[PDB]
């Protein structure tokens, strides 16, 4: 179930937010138009080792 | 502003690389430079770690202890050796309150020197991790190891300079640690032990550190280091061998200022425990504040060590004051020392009397 949850999020993340009737218009408009973290991760890995 | 003061101090060849790189004159007052740096260059520290240059684990633990205490970490800053590893570890820790690194590397060694913010990318080159870099040159490119004298003078002045914080009789510890078997390191050790500076060395893997650790006359020294330093013995002439014997005899004269840590022990946090024991031995040797039991208790308590502390003073049995740690226990509660207030309660104090209304309100 948790896994399945992700999918829906991803789907609704792909379409962002848009009401259905404005969603159709937005789809038509789109069709017309169409480092430090790594260092911290390394330090955490050293701590884990 | 600062450039004018720097130029006037020498009475130039100074530039900021970007922490702060400065060139100093040998015939200068270390006290004045230290005072100026404290006033403007950086803040003040209670503790200053002195570096004289499994092992990586010990060095990392020492770095963590220094960062937690906020102590300054003096080092040579040489690119080749443990200095680069220490700089990398310091950078990694700072990536994750503030750690400050000091490099003592004479300008003569550097082969790429330029006179606002000069940029260098890459002999005797050095690591750029260290925030502050002081280079003491004799005025010629003769590659002399004369910066050690200025380093020792600055350390002696800093020890003389009283610091109210961190107790220790209003003094600074100036902990000294060496792991490399160099003749210059031996001379620095002799000079430091001549002073009140305490030096602690772990057995680890050192050309001379192992010899001194095992040690703790000419024939005795000849037997020692025979296998530890074969190349050094072969290269060193007779005069050098006699000088080695003299330096080591002078160093071994004082056992209070010399601390030996065995590499076989697998105890946790031993890096700080050894330093604490050495500092306590030096403080006991001082004999000025040793009369005041509370004073030594403050320094002992501020550090991790508690087991030896209990025997040293908490054992006592001569005459314990009824008030006992009237403020020491209060500081322990404020300091939040775990498994240490337990001893205050074991010896015992009036909990109601100890926790006065004013004291409770202040807490």
From Swiss-Prot, chain A:
For the null mutant, the annotation states: Trpm8-deficient mice have severe behavioral deficits in response to cold stimuli.
Briefly state the modifications made to the protein after translation.
N-glycosylation is not essential for but facilitates cell surface expression, multimerization, association with lipid rafts and ion channel activity.
**What is the tissue specificity?**
Expressed in dorsal root and trigeminal ganglia. Specifically expressed in a subset of pain- and temperature-sensing neurons. Not expressed in heavily myelinated neurons. Not expressed in neurons expressing TRPA1 or TRPV1.
Q: Which domain of life is it from?
A: Eukaryota
Q: Any idea where this protein resides?
A: Cell membrane; Membrane raft
- Comment field on protein domains: Cooling agents bind within a pocket formed entirely by the S1-S4 helices that opens to the cytoplasm. The coiled coil region is required for multimerization.
Task: Describe its partners and assembly state.
Answer: Homotetramer. Interacts (via N-terminus and C-terminus domains) with TCAF1; the interaction stimulates TRPM8 channel activity. Interacts (via N-terminus and C-terminus domains) with TCAF2; the interaction inhibits TRPM8 channel activity.
What's the stated role of this polypeptide? Answer: Non-selective ion channel permeable to monovalent and divalent cations, including Na(+), K(+), and Ca(2+), with higher permeability for Ca(2+). Activated by multiple factors, such as temperature, voltage, pressure, and changes in osmolality. Activated by cool temperatures (<23-28 degrees Celsius) and by chemical ligands evoking a sensation of coolness, such as menthol and icilin, therefore plays a central role in the detection of environmental cold temperatures.
Regarding protein family, the annotation reads: Belongs to the transient receptor (TC 1.A.4) family. LTrpC subfamily. TRPM8 sub-subfamily.
What name is this protein filed under?
Answer: Transient receptor potential cation channel subfamily M member 8
Residue window of the full protein shown:
994 to 1064 of 1104
